[PDB]
From Swiss-Prot, chain A:
One of its GO terms (cellular component) is cytosolic large ribosomal subunit. GO terms for biological process: translation. InterPro entries: Ribosomal_bL35, Ribosomal_bL35-like, Ribosomal_bL35_CS, Ribosomal_bL35_sf. Residues 1-41 have a biased composition (Basic residues). It comes from Mycolicibacterium smegmatis (strain ATCC 700084 / mc(2)155). The keyword Nucleus does not apply. Residues 47-57 have a biased composition (Polar residues). It comes from the Bacteria. This is Large ribosomal subunit protein bL35. Belongs to the bacterial ribosomal protein bL35 family. Keywords: Ribonucleoprotein, Ribosomal protein.
From Swiss-Prot, chain B:
GO terms for molecular function: rRNA binding; structural constituent of ribosome. It comes from the Bacteria. One of its GO terms (biological process) is translation. The chain holds residues 55 to 210 of 215 of the full protein. Residues 1-46 are annotated as: Disordered. One of the primary rRNA binding proteins, this protein initially binds near the 5'-end of the 23S rRNA. It is important during the early stages of 50S assembly. It makes multiple contacts with different domains of the 23S rRNA in the assembled 50S subunit and ribosome. This is Large ribosomal subunit protein uL4. Part of the 50S ribosomal subunit.
From Swiss-Prot, chain C:
This is Large ribosomal subunit protein bL20. Belongs to the bacterial ribosomal protein bL20 family. One of its GO terms (biological process) is ribosomal large subunit assembly. HAMAP family: Ribosomal_bL20. Pfam families: Ribosomal_L20 (PF00453). It comes from the Bacteria. Keywords: Ribonucleoprotein, Ribosomal protein, RNA-binding, rRNA-binding. InterPro entries: Ribosomal_bL20, RIBOSOMAL_L20_CS, Ribosomal_protein_bL20_C. One of its GO terms (molecular function) is structural constituent of ribosome. Signal peptide: none annotated. CDD domains: Ribosomal_L20. Binds directly to 23S ribosomal RNA and is necessary for the in vitro assembly process of the 50S ribosomal subunit. It is not involved in the protein synthesizing functions of that subunit. GO terms for cellular component: ribonucleoprotein complex; ribosome.
Amino acid sequence: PKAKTHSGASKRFRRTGTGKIVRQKANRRHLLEHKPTKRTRRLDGRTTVSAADNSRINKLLNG
Amino acid sequence: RGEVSGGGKKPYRQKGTGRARQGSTRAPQFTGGGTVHGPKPRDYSQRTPKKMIAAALRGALSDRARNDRIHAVTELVEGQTPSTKSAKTFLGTLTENKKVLVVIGRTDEVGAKSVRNLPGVHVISPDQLNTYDVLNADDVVFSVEALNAYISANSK
Amino acid sequence: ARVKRALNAQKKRRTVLKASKGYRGQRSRLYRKAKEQQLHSLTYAYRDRRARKGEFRKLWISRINAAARANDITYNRLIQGLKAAGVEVDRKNLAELAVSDPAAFTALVDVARAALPEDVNAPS
RNA sequence: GUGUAAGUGCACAAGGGAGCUUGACUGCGAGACGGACAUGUCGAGCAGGGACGAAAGUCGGGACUAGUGAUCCGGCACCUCU
RNA sequence: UCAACCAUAGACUCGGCGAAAUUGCACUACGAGUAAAGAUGCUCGUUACGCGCGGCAGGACGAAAAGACCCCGGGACCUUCA
RNA sequence: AUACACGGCCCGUACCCCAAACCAACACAGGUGGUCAGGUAGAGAAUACUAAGGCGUACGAGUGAACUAUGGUUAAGGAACU
RNA sequence: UUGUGCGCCGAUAAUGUAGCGGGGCUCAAGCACACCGCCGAAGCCGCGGCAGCCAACGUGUUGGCUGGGUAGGGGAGCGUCCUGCAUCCGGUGAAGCCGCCGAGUGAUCGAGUGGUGGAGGGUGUGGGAGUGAGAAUGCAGGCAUGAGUAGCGAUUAGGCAAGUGAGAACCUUGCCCGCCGAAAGACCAAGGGUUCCUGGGCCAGGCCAGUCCGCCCAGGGUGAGUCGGGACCUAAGGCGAGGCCG
RNA sequence: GGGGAUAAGCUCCGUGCGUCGAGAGGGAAACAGCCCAGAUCGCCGGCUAAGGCCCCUAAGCGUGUGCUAAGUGGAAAAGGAU
RNA sequence: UCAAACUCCGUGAUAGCUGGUUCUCCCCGAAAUGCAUUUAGGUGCAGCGUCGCAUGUUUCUUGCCGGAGGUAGAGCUACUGG
RNA sequence: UCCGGCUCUACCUGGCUGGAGGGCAGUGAGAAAAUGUUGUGGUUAGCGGAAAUGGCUUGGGAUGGCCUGCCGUAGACGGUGAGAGCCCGGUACGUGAAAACCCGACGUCUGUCUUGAUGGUGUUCCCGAGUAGCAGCGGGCCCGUGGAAUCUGCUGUGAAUCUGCCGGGACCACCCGGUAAGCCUGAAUACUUCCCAGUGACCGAUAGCGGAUUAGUACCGUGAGGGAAUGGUGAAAAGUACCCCGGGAGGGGAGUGAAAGAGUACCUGAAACCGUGCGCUUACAAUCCGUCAGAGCCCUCGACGUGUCGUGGGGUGAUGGCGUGCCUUUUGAAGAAUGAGCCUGCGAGUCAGGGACAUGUCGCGAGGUUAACCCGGGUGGGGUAGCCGCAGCGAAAGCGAGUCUGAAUAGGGCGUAUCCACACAAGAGUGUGUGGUGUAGUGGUGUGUUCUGGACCCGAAGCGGAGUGAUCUACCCAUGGCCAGGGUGAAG
RNA sequence: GUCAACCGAGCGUUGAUCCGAGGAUGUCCGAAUGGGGAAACCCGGCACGAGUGAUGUCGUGUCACCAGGCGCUGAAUAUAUAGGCGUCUGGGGGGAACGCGGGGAAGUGAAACAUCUCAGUACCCGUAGGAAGAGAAAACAAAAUGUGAUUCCGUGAGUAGUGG
């Protein structure tokens, strides 16, 4: 049979044009009462995945 | 191990016995026991594409043509009565090599029925024309109807 | 498809057990016991091939030294003398001389006597 | 003495005191540290709109490092998204 | 204390039938020592004619049982205001 | 009531049966329910000898070994053994 | 009185010298300082063969460096079976097996020959694998060491003559002897199933042998109005028309 | 360098320090980690390292000058002693 | 055989666990450390290995110049304490 | 279409009840039974069927080799004394069925519309009721109670008939589609106890079905239930007549036979293992059992000479030196840590799948390739539904070589194959606008890892479902039997 | 017939042995069905027939249960019913898989685990057929002027989504 995909890795990982892998960043949802805005501001956007986990993430996304 | 007869009872204790540990009387290391990684009923076909196939066939016919082994013929016989002696004499006229291919259509059954029984010959219809049957040969005898069909079927 | 294994084993069994005709007991009959001893055997042969050089050289030296000492010179000073004199003969052949022709060996002894330094324990 | 443990610093004061006052902002961020990874730390400089000051200029919390808890699932306000 | 003697079934000898568990090998000494820290097998010395029979039971970390005490992991069954 | 002539079905009957024939893996010192119950001594179906009756049962012949098992007697003392 | 170089006592554990590795050594074969030589390793060199990386050149030659290796990564190969295709040997003796003589750097090889034996095999190229065993307290069969050892199944105990027989401790008979005798005796039920009798037999079996046997083969043999059961009856309990529940 | 008794063949950290692991050969009496040295195969060739030259064991009962009298060499303390 | 029988089936149950895993040569060749961990005997990532491509000496070594450190040591009427 | 009678009734019409030509249909799902012809239509036995005693040699036997001929709508296969197109059996091919069975074909037989239809026109009536719907617990639908439609099960409640009702992912209004709660329906599809005919890069007696051999047998278990082992003489039994030893087994001669190194223990006939002879060696010696040197003796080949060394080779090998089994697992094992008695045979990274990623190779090339399926005696032709690429950014609308955020061209993020050449700005690390060079992916296959499956092999304790077991033992029920002999001396 | 020979006695061109289709016979147990029963073995009834001086015996048939139809009667009890008696037709059990409706786990995976998964699988039940079931729109769709019963295959798609 086919190779089934990983839900989480599909919902928390996408791919751009040139094959990069992309994620979002952490400590953004709650407890913002005391987090300064610069700390709240480098956590926005997306970020390219590390090197070390690229392979693992390929194997999760594809099959 | 899972299709053989029996074996579905632990034949004796785990301990106290002296002898080894065993869980079925049909495991591989026994004598009567299951094959482990055995043959299985499987398919062997593989999906070669149309373009590679036809490229093969054209190249093969070229290999024979350049060396002047493609002969043509209208027929192998006189009217509607098979006689293998006729076809054999005619192939003696036309050829001396051991093996040979014959391409006769469907309706011209007499040539097929005639030349069938010969030792070397291996007859074929050009609708199922292939490559093994070409390359195994030394000479190839087309009918003219066959050539025309082949060519006006491929060329369009 | 099924491939009985008989021939493909018999080959090496025949080899080994041909190569262990002379061994004494289960080392001369049985493959699982002669294989081991073949390991040890070839290994000990290797080691002895490297070391019979030193064995023979030891022998040659003992012969030379006893010959010389019966002509009243020590080995060490004999070889000092021949080194000084540029003489080229090796120890295998000095021993052969000692055995066969002691006269020639005594002549070589005399050469070394002549060519040694005067004051052997000098600070030079 | 430095709000609170200890260290590093502070008299050139970051210690003590008085007047205005809300930058205890919004939109970003070059280049860097540290770095298994996720986290974490500083950051000049640009724009609106301001404070203080005569101006230069400083202000994106506290002398610095601790003072808190990822993700999921729900909740409140606003949006010219469906 | 303090052990002695006697008879039967065995044990020993002869004729017959004739197994067993165990077994890496083998023409399988002792000492002081070295070493995975208790050596038939190594070192250095000492002793010993080859082959058997009856007998003892100090060792071969003897045979038996993939420890039953302990610890870890998994189960089981039992309890209780989990 | 008398006489005569007739019928009177099915199954098991051998053989072992406290056992070399059953249960016991063996021609196994084990287990198996029921029935008559000789004599002399004796309270007695105990126990000793025996009639009827039945077996000598399936490896033997030897031999003053140690030692082990079941038996036997023991000077003087009498639980000191433990 | 200082500092030194060797020294003394303190010193002292259990299988046997036993705190030089031993003999032995001060007529140092012991310590120190200088000196001379030498032995010594798979190190280096010397003569040869192979191999990997690079480089130079010419249609694969040479040269320099290199080459311990477990977990492990990569590369190149032998062998076995079945097959597509082409060719070769084979009852004028294939395979397989025992070999002898030889070969390859190795897995291995002999189209090199002898003996045995009796019908399929080899070669080159490709294809596909139930594709290589020395270990799993591994499975199946066969055979060893222990070993010609322990045992041979009770506490009743055997013997002499004669007998047939190829062959007698044991089988048949004779006379003795000894054992049980509320049993080791005679009769039934369950249970087993021909074990019973006769005739013949002893390559297997009997814990020895055996002319013997519950062993082997063939044949024969079990007779019921009244015996133990059924056709006569019912208890425990079972099955259970209809039936009720589900 | 810590803990320990500034004991452990103890335990825990550092170290472009080492070796063993995965590494043979020589020396250390025998001796994975010590010293030397890092094995392509052959040779009945030569020179050397560590170490050692009375015999066992191939090489020097080597040369020179002094000490040692204790079998020191070939275990050892506080301390004692013409 | 009973702290919950036996047989067939699910079932080839599952084990962070023990054992075992077969022909050859050539080249290179480790680690036993870090963070996390229902985790410490396992595993994930980083570390060290090789294969292929890319970048070409950027690595390493020695010399010279530039830079911060608060260790050994020493010192204390140069502070805190004895 | 004609009439017979009927519309209660005689009379004009409208509407029924009959028969008749006819048509339609039929064993249909649409009503159902049998009928008799009936097709070289099919199945259930079979049959014919071409061509060499060919020659020489080998051999026990020619079906072999070599040389001569032939047949062929038949050289598929097998057997026959060794590979047989021409010997046999049979094939290609054509034949063949009294009876039974199955297909249709018919005529019977049966119905069935025919008394009819096309359209008009304004309003009442009907359009499947304990149901659909709603609420409460629940099942299953991608959907685990969630905003959760549609489909549904049990209870409780409970409506209308066409401006009616149900759905179009809560719900409401509009439009759209459709007309529930009555019923039947072939063909495509799945499967093989049995039967018939064949194929195999499947096994070939420890394999293959457990079963080539009496096989679900023997044997085990009370019982359910487990569950084995054993193939081969040779061409044909011509199976050793006869004699000798022996009680017999068994054997030696004589024979058969091509061979008895084929004797009913029999094709070949390995190793372990068990012995007999011949040569060397071994009883003063401490041995992981070997290796290096090697005396001595014995065998052999060769050059020679009355026996003799050699570019020798082989078996034994006194004596000397060196030397601590194999594997697994361990920091570290010769290890007194595990495992192995020995031989022989058997026994563990496999397969599927347009699966995923990486990489070699081959075709095509800004294109590449088909799936199911259809036709094909075969491996071949077709089949455009699909998928991957060719433009991305953004949560999304949406925009587009740019886009997102933001008030912002003001910075940044992502993207615009890459390089190349000229410019302008800065050297806060280079950027921005031009020009050209022009982008490479895909489908087969091989290798490695990998996902789902028993997933390299063996191994539990123990979980669940359905059944077997109280003949042992625990207890109870129903019904019978057994307890020698001697003492004590309660109540009354 | 055969393992499987041996012996004996025979048949067959008047067509044997052998093969095929239909018939006949078809002991006893078995759904088992007269009653009973420890499966293959015990006892009977009724009609007829054979047989004995009569009985015994023997042979041929038939007798269970329910569901339905028909027929006779209509108990307590009045209507009348359940029930009872006779006759006629069905069903009853076996099967290798395949199907439809219903019930319905657990070890396993989650590195624990209960929700979840394994699986609505194994297994159990009731009924079938040569195939079954479903099946003629109270359906899809999206303003395209569309499709037109159902089922099974390929794709869509391991996607939209669902999910401690």
